[PDB]
Amino acid sequence: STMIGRILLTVVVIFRILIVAIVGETVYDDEQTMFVCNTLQPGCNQACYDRAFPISHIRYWVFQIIMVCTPSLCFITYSVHQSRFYIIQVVFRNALEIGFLVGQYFLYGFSVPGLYECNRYPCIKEVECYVSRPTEKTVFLVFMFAVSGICVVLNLAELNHLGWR
Amino acid sequence: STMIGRILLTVVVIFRILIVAIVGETVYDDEQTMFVCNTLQPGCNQACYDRAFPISHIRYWVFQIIMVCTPSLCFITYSVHQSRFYIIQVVFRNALEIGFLVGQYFLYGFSVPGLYECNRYPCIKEVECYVSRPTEKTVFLVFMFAVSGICVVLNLAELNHLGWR
Amino acid sequence: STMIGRILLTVVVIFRILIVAIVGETVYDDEQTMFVCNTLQPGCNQACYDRAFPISHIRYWVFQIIMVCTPSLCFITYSVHQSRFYIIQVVFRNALEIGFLVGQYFLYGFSVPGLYECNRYPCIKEVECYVSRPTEKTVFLVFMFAVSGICVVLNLAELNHLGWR
Amino acid sequence: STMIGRILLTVVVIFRILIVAIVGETVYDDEQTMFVCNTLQPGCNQACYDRAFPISHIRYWVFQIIMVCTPSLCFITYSVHQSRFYIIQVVFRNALEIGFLVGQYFLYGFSVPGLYECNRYPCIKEVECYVSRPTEKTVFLVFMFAVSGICVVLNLAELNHLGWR
Amino acid sequence: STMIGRILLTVVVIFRILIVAIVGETVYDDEQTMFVCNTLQPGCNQACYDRAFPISHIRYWVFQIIMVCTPSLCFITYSVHQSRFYIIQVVFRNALEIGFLVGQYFLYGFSVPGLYECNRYPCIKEVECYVSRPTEKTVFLVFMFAVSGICVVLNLAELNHLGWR
Amino acid sequence: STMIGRILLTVVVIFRILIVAIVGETVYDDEQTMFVCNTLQPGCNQACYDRAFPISHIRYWVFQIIMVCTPSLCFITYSVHQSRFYIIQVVFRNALEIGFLVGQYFLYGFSVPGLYECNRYPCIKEVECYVSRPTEKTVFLVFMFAVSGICVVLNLAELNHLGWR
Amino acid sequence: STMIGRILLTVVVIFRILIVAIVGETVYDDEQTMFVCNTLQPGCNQACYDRAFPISHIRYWVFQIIMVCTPSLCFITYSVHQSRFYIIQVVFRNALEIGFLVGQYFLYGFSVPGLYECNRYPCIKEVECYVSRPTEKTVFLVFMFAVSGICVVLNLAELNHLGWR
Amino acid sequence: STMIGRILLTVVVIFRILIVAIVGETVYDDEQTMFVCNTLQPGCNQACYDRAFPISHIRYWVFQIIMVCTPSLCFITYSVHQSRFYIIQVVFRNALEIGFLVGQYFLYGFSVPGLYECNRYPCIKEVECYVSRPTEKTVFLVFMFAVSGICVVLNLAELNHLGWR
Amino acid sequence: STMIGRILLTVVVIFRILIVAIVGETVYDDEQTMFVCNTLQPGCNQACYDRAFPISHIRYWVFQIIMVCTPSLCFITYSVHQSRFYIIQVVFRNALEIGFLVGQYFLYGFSVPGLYECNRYPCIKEVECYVSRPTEKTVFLVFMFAVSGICVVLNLAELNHLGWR
Amino acid sequence: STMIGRILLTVVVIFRILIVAIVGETVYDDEQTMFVCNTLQPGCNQACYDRAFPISHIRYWVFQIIMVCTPSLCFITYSVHQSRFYIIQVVFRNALEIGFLVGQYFLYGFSVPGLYECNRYPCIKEVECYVSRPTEKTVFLVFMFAVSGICVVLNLAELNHLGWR
Amino acid sequence: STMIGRILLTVVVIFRILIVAIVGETVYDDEQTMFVCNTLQPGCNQACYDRAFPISHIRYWVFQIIMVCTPSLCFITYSVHQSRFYIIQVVFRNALEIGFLVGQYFLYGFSVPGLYECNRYPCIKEVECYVSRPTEKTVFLVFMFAVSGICVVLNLAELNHLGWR
Amino acid sequence: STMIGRILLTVVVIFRILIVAIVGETVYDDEQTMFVCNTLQPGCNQACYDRAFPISHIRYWVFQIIMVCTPSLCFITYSVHQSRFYIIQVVFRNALEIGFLVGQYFLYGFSVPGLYECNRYPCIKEVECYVSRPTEKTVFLVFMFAVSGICVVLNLAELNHLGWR
């Protein structure tokens, strides 16, 4: 039962990479061009879009995917150049995945609303703005959260079998 | 007769992958840019498009194609690492393909109409909107439904020869 | 004389694949963006374009190219897994190529006109619309018809040498 | 002296392929979007552009490049499957290259002018239209004519050494 | 401890290359199209954008990435063709990386502001302009500065072990 | 000292190829779309852009890069088919590189100005036009001139060691 | 007390004439030009304005003012040409003034609302339209109703003193 | 009874003059500016308006009012300069008023419709146009017809008392 | 001293009439056409203008001028038809002028501001609007208040000489 | 019979004055604002309108009306200041009226066409322009020609009775 | 010599009245509609026009013309109702004319410039605005100043003949 | 012969007054609104119109008409209040009419051209502008010059009969 778990970790990792690389590049393609606010002021659109979406979802996910694969590359390069490395890389992977999951929760939450109200200069008082494609982005958010949670659960499993404290 | 059936399963799977990857990427390319509603309200176009098409067809199909190939990858990785796996992966493939076919039917139906009437905020009362390229999308829908049905029929065939109950 | 015919079948097939893949992707690129009608009604452009061009030429040709190569793939996979197959695949290829040629003739004809008059809702009475790049598309149509005819002639040749009735 | 000539034929062929594939795809990219006529009539722009440029230069050149390489592929496939073929393929190459050069001269001439005057329906009387990037296209025309002429000269050389009449 | 340092240099170099190649190409894509100034003068937008951003960040980083890999290529080619080379290439790498880091600091600083005021001809007096996506670009700046600093620290480490003065 | 010079020639050639292929394709992307003149005449923009930039910089550089590599390909093909060739190809490389450098100097100079005044038909008298991104293009010009000069210097070095007169 | 009543009738009549002639001509001046509906359909504005305001207030009032002065002119012309006439003209004046007051009440009511919703062809479903200057027009309505009521009361007074039944 | 009839003729004539001069000048003021057709063709609006309304109602009525007062002016001037004149001027007035009433009926009818469909050059096929203020104009038409009929009836009365045949 | 006061009353009355009739008709001419709000909503301009200026200044002043002259007309008509009337008309004039002055103060105040913020449907939240010609209108307000005050003072003077209580 | 002719001259003169003064001022009001040509050139509209209508009809008619009344004013002033004058003024009136009628015929003809084609600088080649209200203007032309002809006939009558040669 | 001076005062007064009433009403007609500023901000045009021209020239002149005629009206009314009045009215006329001339000089100066630079909210920093018809307005200013000066000189003349101190 | 000359002076004066007052007010009505220049600069239109037409023709003519009637008014007022005056007023009239005629010639010339080229700030270099209605204005110029010349000739006639030197 604990033997097959490794296979599921490898399969989930590859599945996540494929989903992000093949489909995610094109939901966000028109994110700023189809964002519109009810106003006549030059420059209000730029400021309000920047305030609503500081970092796009797909950039965060690509960065996370690349960064969680670094301990494996280090371990592989070590063996090519030539037990402690295994434990250390497991600890580092655990830390990286919990940090990234909590950061995801704190940055974005669990939904993308359809309306946004912004009151940043050069806008006059508060104005109302409207988002493009909220439902698809919410579904993507929830799916990615679930898959990353599965991965977090899986990595903790192996730690306790080898680890003691 | 039951021997050749496996060859037809492999050929249909590859055919589906090729059709989705080569042609589908470009029928949907202008889906939102050429969607137009009869109105003068900012933000009505975004809301009504989001209500008419929550998830685009091609995203659902790519996800389905990737997800129905996971039991094979798991079985292959197992053998590389090193009879029960065959039966279990057959059961899982059957379940995944029936679930995806029923979900397709419940989400989209069998046609894409040319007109859509929307009454979502910020629109005033009900408004009329107009869709781009309905006939091509309807043809694609019907073809994909037929091919997936063929695959469903084929997978059930092998289950009953080996299975008992 | 009948020996070299096979070489010409292989060369024509590859030539057709290359022409469709390399050049055809870009004549049709702006098909809908540069289609214009003389009217002030929202939504008339979409309906009239959909009525004039239900399925784009290049989509039909890509589908045909992929579908006429399936019996060969089936025969090849059979030998990898391990005389009747040869005859059957020849019959199937013949049927597929005659069906596709007749369907091409019935769907599109032999020319693309420069003007089109449309009377579909929401348009008021009949309106006049104007097509982009008719001459290039007509030339492409005629060339593809000629090449497919050559292939049809070639496939019938081998059938009668081996076949009897 | 006649020995090295073959090397120059191979080098010129590869040079032509590289120049057409790498640079030509992007001079013509905006050919129709930046073509403009002095008029207020819908549909006059489409008709006048179609009359000025029936077939784009780059499509003709790609077709020519692919078609002049067919006798070599036939000869190569023959040897793989298994003196007369050499002579026949030389004759065919000669014919194809003279035909394509004369056709180029008759279709396009030696320059692309900056102004064009068109009197096709739906335009009222004659109107004046203006072309984008004439100088670059003229230079490309002249260079391609020179290279193709060199190739024509080279192919005739070998014919007379082996040929008699 | 000094042994593993080389592995971290190789991993950081590859990580930097991947981050620049995969994600950076698309934050800057719309840099000039969504830059807008409050004015009615033709040509003021071009001049003010040119004054605000003389060289785009991504061009500088790509150039730096390519240029810091030249001593390694020279050393590798030398061995293929066939101790002093090692020391010299280390000195050159050190010099190149300190020069590039200082140049980065002097050209761009540590942030990208949201507003810019420009007074260049043909603009009348001073005008106000507005930048697109400042926060994402600031984050990218800071991350790249940190990674390059790590690399600078690492390269100095090996110099002092072998070097004396 | 003269031995290592060959390595530097190979490294500079590869460096130039990489810089042109990876970065240059995108500075010039919007060259004509963001070129604007102060006028109300149709067709003045096209004529004045054509007069200011007859051949784009990147097309000239790609052509030069491809053309300066032909003697090497000829020499390589000769050896594959099977001392005088070495001397002749050196002479030809020298001639090609001096000709291309002088042509660069005579066509473009050393800078790209921000303003251009044009008086070509259909423009009325003289008009003023405005260029996009002058500083980046000037920097690229200067860098390419320097690298090509280095290559010219290097090729002359080897000529005089083997050559006499 | 009944003697002075005649003076008040003459003063009220002149007051009404002055108010209508001097001020009313300019509140209604922009009635249709500043009427706007939320729609993109040609011709919807005309139909909805016609349905909201069939006869403008000021035209009705001018007609009424002119028509209620006809019995006096007839009586005056009779005397110029040369007791029964007095009674008859009093009866006719009474009838005309009650008819006009009731018609005013039935046509317009007591207020002008700021919003109007119209569903007349060529409009799609129901649309919302917006009125200009509602408060001033409501005040004018109420004032005119009050003055006309005073006149009605005054004319009945004299009838009963001379009349019996 | 026949004595008072003359007074009613004078009163009706003055009433008609006042109504036409005071109110009619401003219903028709915006007749052409607010006439709109669904089309993109220059010059279609002018032609279709000219075809729908060849002579405006108010011009016809002013001309009629002036022309029916000429016999009186002639008779008056005759007496100033100094029984047969009375009879002749009565005959002429009768003829003029019947001719003008019949001409009114034949030119305009009894209503002004809200829609008009026009198929005059330069319009393409038939187009639909929309009229401004139809109800007010219909009411004016009917009122003027009634008043002119009353006048016709009155003039015939006096003719038969003096006339015999 | 009290004798000349009557002359000053007559002169001030005529002066006020002249100023209102000759100059006031044209300061307010463009009141609504040059009123503008920062918004993209149809119908917000109408509602906010109606809320800012319910009754225009010039309409109120014309009404006041006409209404304060009615007791004089009544007294004059009485004498034409044929001491108590003098006292009563003085009381009525006093009452009318105090009522109109207080009403002016309560409706408009003492200034017209340049900015106005409105939050009436269909506007979204609060919006900012901008007034035309505030200074001229403020000056007119103050001048009219001063003149009317002078008239009020003058009318009270005569009341106390004849009146007792 | 010749006695009454003078009365008809006076009546026709007054009738003409009234028709020109009351109705003609408003058919021509929008003559240039609703004149439109199919072109994109600034300044073509002005030149083509000036070429089509050098002097407006109504200006010519007003000038004629004023100028044909000068001999009467001279004769009247002479008598006020204090047989030959009568004859001379008759001769002058005859001459003025024949000259003005012939000039009318030579300047304008008998109709106003709906289309006009103009080829004046700055227009490119020939362009097509469209006239407003042709039918009403044609009717006015014909009526004025008829009335002026009647006047010409009448003035000749009196000349021959008094004149001899 | 002092006798004729009165005639010149009466003639100058009437001349001034005629010039102001007949010509001045139409130079200023388009004062605000053709005033334009180089900016994209709503509401900047209104504020800057209000700051440049607080009170229009023609309003000031009409007010002055009416106000300088009040002592004459008072004196005339006095005589109608029925030596000290003559002296007092002369003193008052003198005072009014010097005050109005000095006020004119302090408000407007001696010229109207063609450019104006404004820095009032809501404008961003300083902006440049452009005036319509400066030369005609400057000429009018100078002429009115000269005529008013002549009148001032004339009124002082009579004061010193009758006055002592 | 010299007796009748006075009558012709009175008739010409009245004729000129009538022509200027009745027709001239409406040729110049749209002088600035239909003036257009080929440019994109704000404020160039105002400056170039001001430079082309400093004082409009009709303003100069009205001023001249009023000013040449002042000596008559002075002489008339003198006689009302109560030989030298006659001579002096004749001298003054002569001087005024020669001065005004020469000033007309020096200001305007004899024609109004259709094109005007202007190079005033804020325009860039020289630009081309286009005038409205040149032919009608030229005809008016010539007619007014002729009439004023006739008047000049007439006034000199009487001077020499009474005058000596």
Numbering used by the authors:
A (entry chain E), B (entry chain F), C (entry chain A), D (entry chain B), E (entry chain D), F (entry chain C), ...: 19 to 100, 196 to 278
Sentences from the paper on this structure:
Connexin 36 (Cx36) is responsible for signal transmission in electrical synapses by forming interneuronal gap junctions.
Wild-type Cx36 (Cx36-WT) proteins were solubilized in lauryl maltose neopentyl glycol (LMNG) and cholesterol hemisuccinate (CHS) and purified as dodecameric GJCs. While Cx36-WT and Cx36-BRIL in soybean lipids were mainly in the PLN conformation, those in detergents were mainly or completely in the FN conformation, suggesting that detergents contributed to the PLN-to-FN transition more than lipids. Since the GJC pore in the full FN conformation is funnel-shaped, detergents with large head groups may be more tightly packed at the intracellular layer in the pore, resulting in increased FN protomer populations.
